[PDB]
Structures are given as structure tokens and as C-alpha cells.
Amino acid sequence: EFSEWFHNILEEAEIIDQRYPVKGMHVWMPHGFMIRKNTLKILRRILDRDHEEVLFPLLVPEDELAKEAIHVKGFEDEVYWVTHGGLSKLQRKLALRPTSETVMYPMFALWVRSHTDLPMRFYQVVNTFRYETKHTRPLIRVREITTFKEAHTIHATASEAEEQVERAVEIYKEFFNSLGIPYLITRRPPWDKFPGSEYTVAFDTLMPDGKTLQIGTVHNLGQTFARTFEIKFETPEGDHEYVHQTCYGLSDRVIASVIAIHGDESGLCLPPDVAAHQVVIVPIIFKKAAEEVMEACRELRSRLEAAGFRVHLDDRDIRAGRKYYEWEMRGVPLRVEIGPRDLEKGAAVISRRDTGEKVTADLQGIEETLRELMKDILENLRTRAWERMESEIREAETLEEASRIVDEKRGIISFMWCGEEECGMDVEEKVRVDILGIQEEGSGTCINCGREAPYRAYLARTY
Amino acid sequence: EFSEWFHNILEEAEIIDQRYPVKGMHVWMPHGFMIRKNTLKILRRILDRDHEEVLFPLLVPEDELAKEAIHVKGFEDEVYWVTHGGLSKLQRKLALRPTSETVMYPMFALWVRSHTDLPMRFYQVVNTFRYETKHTRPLIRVREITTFKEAHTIHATASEAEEQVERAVEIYKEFFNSLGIPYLITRRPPWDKFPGSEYTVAFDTLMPDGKTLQIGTVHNLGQTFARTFEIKFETPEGDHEYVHQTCYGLSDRVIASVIAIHGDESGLCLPPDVAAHQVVIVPIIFKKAAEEVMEACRELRSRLEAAGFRVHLDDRDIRAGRKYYEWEMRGVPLRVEIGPRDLEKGAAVISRRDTGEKVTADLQGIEETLRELMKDILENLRTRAWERMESEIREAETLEEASRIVDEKRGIISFMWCGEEECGMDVEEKVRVDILGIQEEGSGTCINCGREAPYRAYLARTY
Numbered sequence A, B: 001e002f003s004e005w006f007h008n009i010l011e012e013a014e015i016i017d018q019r020y021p022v023k024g025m026h027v028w029m030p031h032g033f034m035i036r037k038n039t040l041k042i043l044r045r046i047l048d049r050d051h052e053e054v055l056f057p058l059l060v061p062e063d064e065l066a067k068e069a070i071h072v073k074g075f076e077d078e079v080y081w082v083t084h085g086g087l088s089k090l091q092r093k094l095a096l097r098p099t100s101e102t103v104m105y106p107m108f109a110l111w112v113r114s115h116t117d118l119p120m121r122f123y124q125v126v127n128t129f130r131y132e133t134k135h136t137r138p139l140i141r142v143r144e145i146t147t148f149k150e151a152h153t154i155h156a157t158a159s160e161a162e163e164q165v166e167r168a169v170e171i172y173k174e175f176f177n178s179l180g181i182p183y184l185i186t187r188r189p190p191w192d193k194f195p196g197s198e199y200t201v202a203f204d205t206l207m208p209d210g211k212t213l214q215i216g217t218v219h220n221l222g223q224t225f226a227r228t229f230e231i232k233f234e235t236p237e238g239d240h241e242y243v244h245q246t247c248y249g250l251s252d253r254v255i256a257s258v259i260a261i262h263g264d265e266s267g268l269c270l271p272p273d274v275a276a277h278q279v280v281i282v283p284i285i286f287k288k289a290a291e292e293v294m295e296a297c298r299e300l301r302s303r304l305e306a307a308g309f310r311v312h313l314d315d316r317d318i319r320a321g322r323k324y325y326e327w328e329m330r331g332v333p334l335r336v337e338i339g340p341r342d343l344e345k346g347a348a349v350i351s352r353r354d355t356g357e358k359v360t361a362d363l364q365g366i367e368e369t370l371r372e373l374m375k376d377i378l379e380n381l382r383t384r385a386w387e388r389m390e391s392e393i394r395e396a397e398t399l400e401e402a403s404r405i406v407d408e409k410r411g412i413i414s415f416m417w418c419g420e421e422e423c424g425m426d427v428e429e430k431v432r433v434d435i436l437g438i439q440e441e442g443s444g445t446c447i448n449c450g451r452e453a454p455y456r457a458y459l460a461r462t463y
């Protein structure tokens, strides 16, 4: 039911057009692009506090790409290769970046010299490529990840590195909270960690179809890559030690989930700071004081722009009903309606998208009424969102109880686990599900093998 | 002399790092990225008035790419090809986009139905690829054009199309004028026009090395592509005619020239709206009322941010001289210095980057003093820039006189020309130069064959 809803809203709201001749690569239409634009603004505002945006190349040569042991093995047959330059065969294959470690790190080897240079914190929003699962999924599983934000950091000590992982996690919480997106943070099993890292911390959110979606990962690379690409630095004494690195990223999935999580029957419902417009003004007219209703709306439009609002005056010549539907299915948070009556009173009608509540405010200070309203809509959407998720995270003591709950209610399954490879794999097979990750807490007994369970683990069916 | 200057400033100012293992593909370092960021802001501000930003795929399949006659022949051996997906050979080659006509147009065939749909005006800033001339030139001739802005439009009548070409030209003038970049607008010879178009209008600017650089092109595609990709629309009567299209674009060259044209011995000199910082505050201190000088600067920083300034307080512990040099070689327009004296008077020292003029203003309204100063710096830079260029456009009546002037003074060569293929090619060979384009004006006699010259043509040695 969700799948269809999703696909339809993507088309109706004109977010992306999937009709491109190459499976797994979609086009961002104007509206979609605007949402992507605002989502990225929120993100960069956070990231730019302590990160320096850069922009590295798209292509990587075998020499560099395969310089890693596990990492190269992790994307082995998942990389696209350019082999010819025109009609001639390049004397060195070039791979489209799946992620940029092998692109930036050799460059980092150069940029890093003294401890005075560290720490360095960079990030970029580029397009990456990954040849994967025949099942192509709009903004969730694409071949061309059009909005891949990857951040990479460099530190002097393993200590600061771990500290960074913490900082990153806080950055994502803030990012997500701004989008009103709920999430579960866990430590992925050592066999799922980013190829070559020490460990991976992942953020998973819940889709309306009871399935889980990885919406962000942070990885502690320790000195593994440092040694691979020779990234050393001079200590205050005069020694040469390898740097400690971390990296983390998000993709178009962040946009997928904002659309999905605050979904609706009316269409899109987005956080005010993400919508293409925060306030759409709809003038009501039937050839009665029209010239006055209009000039009232225009005055308002201008007035709102000057206050810093992404406003749009819909003065098209169509029934106000159709207008309501359109801006509503597109996710505009606030609709301001003005007609002869209200007008001849110094007031208007403000309608919420998340609730539907129409209220009456005085155009004589409406600017502040709207801001409050916007703050209110996010909190509500964020709240509702969290309730809906937590109410789907269910505990299980029996491996059988799990299978029942998963199959019948979907959602997330909380449980105690020993944290062993074989035991974990066994759990997944028997339940046909994936172990998202762990959360260190008080002991217990592994839901499967009954041995001592040091971890609180989560389980669910993912994307 | 310029070449070296350029390469050195790119490194010293940390704009791009060219040390990437793949020739023709550079890395945008933090500082460079910021300039690129601001340059694009200026551009988008103009473009977003009547254009809708989108984002299409990077890869195009042979089927689509080769669907054109001349266009495919124009980029034939200039395209990079991905042939394998992992370790398996794709059953359909995919080419990295050199430009996106063959990527968007088939999609346009779908988006366009009724005349009610037209006109459509789109644009995107993506990365394109072109396998060309062994001579790789930073921001001027790269294999990965990291800042390729391409706009494509669709119209109902050939009339509006030409009208669009005019609109585009005005948009670029405004863009460039904002960057204080001078330019010559001409109609490229029909053998140099964009592959498949009706005609190409180009913007060329002059580099400090007396060479010309194409910094922008507008193309009128007529209905050539419309017919190739079947982009028809329903007329108000009920007929189905092919649409009239145009497209235009800029590249990293725009950034190259902003750096080059307002070059300097001290380093970079940029228009206030392009620099990473518009105002850098440098506090002068020698352990005398320090705590007061500092709190005075901080108050100022905050105060400027609130006014909308991209300000930076350099409170590092180093000699104010070194600071002056740094922010000066980086191109910051205004330096505000504060010391015990000036401070105990309610004033500070404001230094210009373009001139060097240091003045004294009252911190009690400095905000407005700076804005004026910024407006002044652009006008000066823009002016100086225009003088320098026009003073290098020299007329020639003799094909020999041309060779003398070109070889001795470089620059642009104005002349009357018949506008014939053979005659033009002959001119180029004999003078070892390129005919930039024409400008319809009063007749005369072709500098070469003495026949009737309908056009005013320009000549120069280009990049």
C-alpha cells in the first residue's frame, strides 16, 4: 500500500521522473529539486560550523581504488568502469566513485604534514555510483546516488577520532530532528561494518510499510586507511605516526524518508523549512471588491518576503478548491486565504497542513503568527513521528515470538543477544530478517542460544 | 608570465590542488570552493527569476547519445565510456555526459504535450566530461568540468526562441558585469557553431597573456533536436508541430577569468560578492588595552554579521603584517584594523584591496561605509577591466598588418570580412589565429579577398 502511495506522490507532486532509459537513475524535476535544495540548506548550515566543504573528482584509477584490502573487496563488482576515451582504450581503467575514500585519501597524504595541521574536517555533496541489486528503488536504492553527502575527518589520536564519531552522531540527530525524522542508533555487527573500518554506527528509521531504512552511517576508520595511503604527520617531538580517521554520510534516502514519514492521504506534508513554499497566499474572489482583495494579497506577499518567508501568491484563475488541493498535496505548510469579508476586518484565514485547523489572525501581525505556527507544525510532525516508531519496536524473549511479531506486525524487534557471528546469522536465517545492530546494556540471555547476552540488539526487515 | 602567476596563485590561495593522479581533473580545496560557492550564488540569483533548476543523470546510452546526426559527430571521440558493471560487460555502453542534450531531450518529449505547457526554461549545474587536447589547463581546459551550468529552453515558435537567445545574452551580461568581467559578443562562424544548432553566439574575454577565452555560449537549436527526439506539442487548433529550442552554458572558466582578470602582484583581488570574506577584522595589540581592543572587534564582528556581511575576525596570534598579506593575497576586499588609538576615538582603519587606500571611519556607522566601499570596488575593478580589454582590440586593413599586431601586441584584431568559409580558413592559416565570430554592420572590403565585407569580424589567439 505504501509502495504505491510513494510512487504516485513522487509523480503527482513532480518530485522525480523515473522514466529514464537507464534503470536506477532518475531525474529531479523542479519541485523535487526545491525540496532537495532546502533539505541540503538545513544540512550545510549544521555541517559548515566545523567542516570545510570541498569537491573532489568523480573518477578513480584501479591503482588507487584497489589500494585497499577489504574496501576494494567490498565494492569489487559494484563499481562502474570507464575503459575507453573516445574510441581508444584508456591504458588505465577509471572507476566511477562508489564513495570517495580512495579519491581523497591519497590527496590527504599530501595535505597532511604537521600536527599543527590536524584536525581536518571535510565534506562534499556529490553524485556516487553503485552497481547493485537488480531491485531499483526511487531515492532508496539507486545506481546514481544523486545526493550523496560524505564527510571525512582526520585526527592526531585515536581518542579524538572516537570523539568525532560522537560529534557526528550529534550532528545527524540535529539534522534529522530538524526534518522531524525519528531514528534508532546502533552499532552494526562487525561483519556489516563499512569495508575497512573499525566499526560502524548506523541510523535506521521506519517506513510506513513496517520496513527499516538505513538513513545514515558514521564509521571509525582508525588508522587502517592511514597506513594504506601513507597519511602520516609530525608529532611535536619529531616522530611520524599514522593519523586517525573517521567518515560519515547520508543520501537521497533522507529525502525519501521525509516524504514517507510525514506522508498523508492528501499527499505531501513537509517540515516548513523543507517545503518549496512555507506560505501560499490564496485570494478568494467572485467579482466583488476584487481589486481590493488582490492588492491586499500582494501587499501581504511582499510583506512576507521581506520577513524572510518562502511565500507564493497563487493568483491563477481557477477555483480556490483546486488551489487548496494542489498546494496541499505538494506539502505547503500554511495556506493564507483572503476574501472580501475577512479583508474588511483586517484579518485572514490561516490553514495548517499537518492538522487542518483553520484559524483567524490579524493581518496586522500575522508575520509572527505564522512563525509560531511553523514551529508548532514541526514539533507535532516530529512528535507524531516518534510515537509511530517507538510503538513499533517490540521486545521478544522467544526466537519464535519474534517470527510471530515480525510477520504479523512488522516493525522493529528488540531482544537480548550474545553477539556472536554464527548465532546472529542463525537468527537471521530462522527469522528471515536482518540484525540492525547492538546497544550495550545490562546482560541477559541470548534469545537464541541462551548464553550470556551483553547486548541489546534490534531486528527488522530492511530496504 | 601569466601562466606561472596563475598556477602559483591557485596553489598559494588554495583554490584547487592539481596533484590528482588523473590528468585534467582537479580538486577544489576549501577556499576555492567558497569562491565557487559565491560565484554560483550570484548566477542562480539571476537564473532563478525565470528558470527552473533541475538535475538529470550523468550517464547516457549509445542509443540516445548517437540519436543525433551532427551532435554525435561533434563529440564522437570526445566521450568517455563505461563498458562494465562490476566485472561484467554492460549489454549497452554508457557515456559520461559531455553536455546533456541527449539526456534531457528524450525526457522533454514526455514532459511536453500542450502549448499550455510552453515555454519551459530549465538549467542545472553539474559535472560534465570531455576527452580532449592533450593540453590540460586548470579551470580552462579540464576533462571533468566541475562547474558546468547548462540551461535549456523550449518554445512554441521560432520567434520566441530567438527572443530567448536575446534574453540569455542579457543574463550573461548581467552575470559577467557582476563579476566585473569584460567581454566581446559575436556570432561564431557556421563551422564552429554548437554541433546541430542553427547558430552560436559566444562571449570571449581577454586573458592577461593577450589570449582570448570563450567564457559563455548561447545556441539556437531551432527545431533540429525537436525532430530528432520527437518533441511535439498540440497547438490551440489541434495540430502537432515541433518545438523551438535554445540552450546556453558557462563553466569553471568563469571562475578562472575572475581570478585572472582582476589579478594582481599581491595575489587575488575579487569582487566583494565573490570573495570568501567581504570584511576581515584585524585587531592590533601589544599588551596595551588588549582586552578592550578585542571586545571592540568582537562587538564589530557580530554587528557586521547581523547586517549580512561575510565577515571574519582574525584573532590569531601572529604579526598583523602576516595577516595583512594573507587576506590580501586571498582577495578579501576590505580589511578593518582596530588599535588602542583609533579605538579610544570610536573609529577604525579601513583598507581597500583594489586600491590600497586606507581611510578612517567611525565605527558608529561603519556598516554603511563598507557597503558603499564595496559598491565602489566592483565599479573600479569592472572599469579598469574594460579599459584594459578595449585597449587591446585593434583594427586592421591589411592581412599583413594583422600578423604584425597579433604577434607583437597580442589581443584582439578587429577587421572587415566577407564571411566565406574558404576565405576565413585562409585568414586563420596565414595569420595562425582563430576567427572568433562576426558582428553585422556597415559593409566594406574583406581584409583578405577585398570582396564585399558585410561583417565586422574579430580575430585572436585563443585558449
Ligand SMILES: Nc1ncnc2c1ncn2[C@@H]1O[C@H](COS(=O)(=O)NC(=O)[C@@H]2CCCN2)[C@@H](O)[C@H]1O
Binding pocket: A098, A099, A100, A101, A130, A132, A139, A140, A141, A142, A143, A145, A149, A150, A151, A194, A214, A215, A216, A217, A219, A247, A248, A249, A250, A251, A252, A253
Ligand atoms: N544505493 C543506494 N541508494 C541510496 N542510498 C544509499 C545507497 N547505498 C547506500 N546509501 C546510503 O548512503 C549512506 C552512506 O553509505 S555507506 O554506508 O556505504 N558509507 C559510506 O559510503 C562512507 C560514509 C561516507 C563516505 N564513505 C548509507 O548509510 C545509506 O543511507
Ligand SMILES: Nc1ncnc2c1ncn2[C@@H]1O[C@H](COS(=O)(=O)NC(=O)[C@@H]2CCCN2)[C@@H](O)[C@H]1O
Binding pocket: B098, B099, B100, B101, B130, B132, B139, B140, B141, B142, B143, B145, B149, B150, B151, B194, B214, B215, B216, B217, B219, B247, B248, B249, B250, B251, B252, B253
Ligand atoms: N574542456 C573545457 N573546460 C572548461 N570549460 C569548457 C570546456 N569545454 C567547454 N567549456 C566551456 O563551456 C561552455 C559551454 O560549452 S559548449 O560551448 O560546448 N556548449 C554546450 O555544451 C551547450 C550549452 C550548454 C548545454 N550545451 C563554453 O562556452 C566554454 O566556456
Ligand SMILES: [Mg+2]
Binding pocket: A192, A434, A435
Ligand atoms: Mg545482515
Ligand SMILES: [Mg+2]
Binding pocket: B192, B434, B435
Ligand atoms: Mg576555428
Ligand SMILES: [Zn+2]
Binding pocket: A417, A418, A419, A420, A423, A424, A446, A447, A448, A449, A450, A451
Ligand atoms: Zn546467541
Ligand SMILES: [Zn+2]
Binding pocket: B417, B418, B419, B420, B423, B424, B446, B447, B448, B449, B450, B451
Ligand atoms: Zn573574404
